[PDB]
Design an enzyme around this catalytic site. Structure first.
Site, PDB file in Angstrom:
ATOM      1  N   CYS A 170      -5.536  22.869   1.627  1.00 60.14           N
ATOM      2  CA  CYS A 170      -6.668  22.880   2.220  1.00 60.14           C
ATOM      3  C   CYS A 170      -6.730  21.086   3.114  1.00 60.14           C
ATOM      4  CB  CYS A 170      -8.103  21.813   0.546  1.00 60.14           C
ATOM      5  SG  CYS A 170      -9.732  22.688   1.868  1.00 60.14           S
TER       6      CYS A 170
ATOM      7  N   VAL B  48     -11.864  20.440  -1.815  1.00 58.66           N
ATOM      8  CA  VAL B  48     -11.114  21.115  -1.627  1.00 58.66           C
ATOM      9  C   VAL B  48     -11.811  22.809  -1.646  1.00 58.66           C
ATOM     10  CG1 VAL B  48     -10.146  21.724  -3.841  1.00 58.66           C
ATOM     11  CG2 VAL B  48      -9.902  18.952  -3.059  1.00 58.66           C
ATOM     12  N   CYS B  49     -11.063  22.938  -0.428  1.00 58.57           N
ATOM     13  CA  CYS B  49     -11.944  24.618  -1.171  1.00 58.57           C
ATOM     14  C   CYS B  49     -12.118  25.975  -2.009  1.00 58.57           C
ATOM     15  CB  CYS B  49     -10.512  25.250   0.611  1.00 58.57           C
ATOM     16  SG  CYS B  49      -8.961  25.064   0.533  1.00 58.57           S
ATOM     17  N   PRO B  50     -12.495  26.398  -1.998  1.00 59.16           N
ATOM     18  CA  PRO B  50     -13.426  26.682  -3.131  1.00 59.16           C
ATOM     19  C   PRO B  50     -12.215  28.018  -3.690  1.00 59.16           C
ATOM     20  CG  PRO B  50     -14.947  27.425  -2.087  1.00 59.16           C
ATOM     21  CD  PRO B  50     -14.191  26.578  -0.906  1.00 59.16           C
ATOM     22  N   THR B  51     -10.684  28.104  -3.304  1.00 60.84           N
ATOM     23  CA  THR B  51     -10.092  29.762  -3.374  1.00 60.84           C
ATOM     24  C   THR B  51     -10.479  30.470  -4.389  1.00 60.84           C
ATOM     25  OG1 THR B  51      -8.453  28.042  -2.396  1.00 60.84           O
ATOM     26  CG2 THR B  51      -7.930  29.988  -2.728  1.00 60.84           C
TER      27      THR B  51
END
Lengths: 170, 167, 167, 170, 170, 167, 167, 170, 167, 167
Positions: A170, B48-51
């Site tokens: 990210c 933070v990306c919700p991967t």
């Protein structure tokens, strides 16, 4: 009651292990500097194929090349561990193994980890990822019938190592 | 103190979830008859990306085709949950999602599942597999940085279902 | 249990606040030498128009010119507060604001001010006037449906400052 | 310890009030079916002009036209309440008043509402808004030197009544 | 619970009194070196004529010529004590008085002397005789409707002083 | 610990009293329908002239004609009380008396009336006026060296009876 | 509860006694160096003749010639004790007596010696032999009706003294 | 703790006794109807002449003719009592005896009577006079070196019997 | 804490045993009506020759000719017990055996019999003779280095049965 | 509660024993540096032949040739022990004996070794092998009807000393 907490120093342990067919005293502190995968399995000599301890053994270099060691533990005695090791694989034994087999005969270690089963007198399938500063990073608990995956463990280790270094990007 | 124990009934919960962009009362007992993947994540709207939520979302039919539902949970309010869903992925939102977002605003559920962080006020990355009889089979707890794999969760669900039938 | 008691030191608090779109740690003791209007509001991102928070920010100079600051607080994360500020007023958001939004994610501050609701997991509408010596002078608690007045809050502050100096 | 809690039944009280110059027994439940502004002041016969009791007095019909009553309380005996009312304003008295003065001689009411000052023996200035079903909607506590405002009180009551009826709106 | 016990130090008190129309801080220990008649009455401004406070007032120099002071107390605020004194007798007031009126607003003094009525919030009529070294010599408690007598009080004080000096004789 | 409380039932007592030179059991409830002046005195046979006990007996009709009885009590045995009555006044004795001398040898009655002295093993000079309904109206406690007045006791009794009937 | 135990120090006491018609402070430790006969009797002035106290009185030299003192005790006051001594034997008194009469008005001593009767308020007939070192050697407890014999008390004192020397 | 109180039912006891050289079970209740002299002595077979048990035995008819029985007790076993009885007197034995010898091997009886010695494991010299209604009338405790007198016991018994019948005259 | 007490019924136990090479569920009461020699040994597969277990197996008929069974137990699992029976003696196994090997995997049996070594996690050498009515008749505890004797165990069993009949 | 625990030091004891016909004060630690067989038997002078005590006495040299002493104990007094030794065997006595007979008159020794029968007031048949360092090595408890064997006790003592050396 369980002493294992994510983000806290993993509970101290020590006991006799079988290491290359000899009895050695082993301690959590022996592992400082490295990541440690510390897993419990239910019992030696059962009629289930020991395919998960075998898997970790067989692929040990995948952990050792990324500064990670593996230790396995059950409530059996070190004498039983030895005998299971010296029993040929083709005969339901474990055969030779490069991962230490730690004995938890008094059950203190298993209780400290929250994996003990009061009514059975052995552990369930428990796995713990402990970092090089001795902090607990990961807990995996499986009901008895279901095994762990070496691939998943490796993913977790590499991921803790990545984020220790680079943060979450990210 | 944590009520979650392998082999015992998974601890009861109820709350408000965002399901398909609306508020609904959701109960653990709603899932009786199906396996359930019940997982917690730390907070909405972080950088933070919700991967992991997206993966479970996109690959949902894979669980549904083996009689499994998925429910995600955090300590955020259901209003924050709805706002995060309504924020476009581009700008840092989740965008539309196919999995309910449960709100544990009171912290009771996190506490009951032993995933609550007393110092932080949100949960760690906790995941639980609950069988069709409401029995807890599996507990996966990660320190905040590291997320969950759908493949692993798939493997485990199938393994519990396999041994239910064949031992 | 509540620590807030008229004529005693307001209870200590500290936490992450959103100040001019950045995370900053904020302590009650940062306010020594000034009056402080400290207030809780229930949740970000609800359907209630946030007119009461907006009014304090929009009339902030009315406080600053009588040596008073204002801090707002809810149980929402700083990440949620920041996302709410970054949502335009025309869309239900807060839009830019001049008052810190303090986060009480662990609930400790709310419990210390006796404004936390165990059943809901958020606060009621509570307002506290603290003097320049950090003594609590005024407590105002409203049931959820009804908000505070900047005019009333101004009267109270001017009155404490007038009786602090005169009869 | 205080029993006053928003959105719970306002704590029960009963006692002797002076109402239109006569002793009356008065109870919280006498007020069911209407809103009630219940407020405490520190003492009778001090050298502070009683602006705020007079203001609520002077403006009572504003509360009454909106189905709302007002009661004042201090820890003074009802005999003191009466003498105070009977003393002309121009001599430090209250003179005629239209609101009940409840007496909290035993201090129990003050304690229950959390307005009681143990070190002084009297109350600070607290005001409470109780709805028509006896549920407490609003608590205002001022340190001693700062009074209340009829206008603010009217606003709060009208907003409680408005939202009781129409919910939360913009 | 009561701390008043014959032949032990009278329980300590302090508070605000009205003395010759002014607020004064007053303490039990202010009286050391003299006998003290300390007595409680129920309330100011009731409809019972205050015969007994007036009587002790009117007769003070009889106590003072024998090295003895008198203090009256109720649970009323000192502001009430003052208004009562300032109200002419012919209107239910006390008018000028020569004895200190101590205020027991917090009720602590009443409790310590065991004269406090929990159900009423005021005291019954109690009277206490404290000697020159602060030791309690005599306790008289009357139910509400019956007053005290200056004559009896004088007799007791003179007998305490007489026996302090000459012991028990016929 | 003391049971005597103004406006409550005087505490129950019973015991052996010397009445007209005979032992008789005596109960407080024997006095219902009449006022009772109940009083303790420290010890029989001391060197203090017993003038205060003598005065109540000698003026007993002043009480009887207003429907009042008098009972005296000390921690001495009934045998000692009887011997004291049988000692002539001219010799330090009590001589014949018209009031019961009640014995509190076990100390219970004195403890119940809160007049017992642990260090001495006897009572102080305590007097109790009890009404015809057995309610305690008046408590008088003196340090040892100073006795009671029949005149004062008469005033009190007449006053309770007057306010019992009138204002 | 009773502190008197054979072989242990006899439990300490002090009080006022009538000795030769006067009040004296008397202590247990006063008798150190001598054997002591320490006995209790129920009450002064009863209608039972004081036969036992008189016998110990008259035959006192017999104890004194074997280095023994005698002390009598009851719960009566020292004033009653003096009055009973001053009452002529003919009229029911004790008359002059050569043994101290200790007063245990507070009941502490009786309680300490286990001779106190909770229901009656006086003691039973208790007798104790205390050696010259202050050690209790002998406990004799009679139900009220029956008294003590000087001859027996003589025999026992001599027997303790004999075996002190010769075993 | 001791259960023996004058004026109360003597504490219940039962155990094996030697009675005419045979083992009989014996109980306090066996004695109802009669006076009982119940005495403890320290031990069988010591080097002190057993002159006090012998005395009571020899003069037993003096008790039996006035409705009184005698029972002796020590912590020895019934087997030891038997052997002491069957040991000729001239040899330090007791010889034949007409009084039962009760064994208190568990020490419960001695504790119940307050005669046990913790540090020695045997009793001191204790004697108890228990009346025909089973009430305890008399307690005698002697330090180990000093014996009881049959004459004194008889005096006490006859005196309790006299006063049971006639009161205390005088 | 140990529950084994002589002349009391032996503490109940149940578990899995290996009997004739098979898992069988076994309990104390399966033995009611026979005598039972129940002994504990420390562990399977140690390097110490297993002479004592072999000795009892070889001599089982001597026990059974006198209505007596033998059961061995250790804290090892039934699985380990089977593997030890299945390992030829010449390789440090036990070889075929005629005595049930009971597993005390939970440690509850060892504790109940007071043979558990809390520091080592296995038993010491304990032997129990339990009679045909379930009553514990004999307890033998040995420090680890020293074994039991069959001849001494036979002697004890015969003596118990002999006295049960003939006294 | 019992203090005897294998591999722990044997519970300390002291008392009077009869040794060679004389009273001697004896204690556990008199034995430090030798092995000690300490056994309990129920009572002196019963009708059961005393075969086991005689047997050990007759065979004392076998114990002493291997650095081992024997001490017998019962709850009977030292006085009874002497009388039993002094009674010719043919009359049910023990006759002369070479083993100290320890007296446990207070019962404290029996309790400490867990051999005391609270209902009977004497011990059961208990035997203890204590090594030269004071450590308890072996515990044998028998129900009353059955005695101990000298041969088995010798075997145990030899095995302990053999393993102390050679493992």
């Amino acid at each position: 009651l369980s002493k294992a907490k994510i983000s806290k120093p993993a509970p101290y342990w020590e006991g006799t292990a079988v290491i290359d067919g000899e009895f050695k005293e082993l301690k959590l502190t022996d592992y400082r500097g490295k990541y440690l995968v510390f897993f419990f399995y239910p019992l030696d000599f059962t009629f289930v194929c020991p395919t998960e301890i075998i898997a970790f053994g067989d692929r040990l270099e995948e952990f050792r090349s990324i500064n990670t060691e593996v230790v396995a533990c059950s409530v059996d005695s070190q004498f039983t561990h030895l005998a299971w090791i010296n029993t040929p694989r083709r005969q339901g034994g474990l055969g030779p193994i490069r991962i230490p087999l730690l004995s938890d005969l008094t059950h203190q270690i298993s209780k400290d980890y929250g994996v003990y089963l009061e009514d059975s007198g052995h552990t369930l399938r428990g796995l713990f990822i402990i970092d090089d500063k001795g902090i607990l990073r990961q807990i995996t608990l499986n009901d008895l019938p279901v095994g762990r995956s070496v691939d998943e463990t490796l993913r977790l280790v590499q991921a803790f190592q990545y984020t220790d270094k680079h943060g979450e990007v990210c």
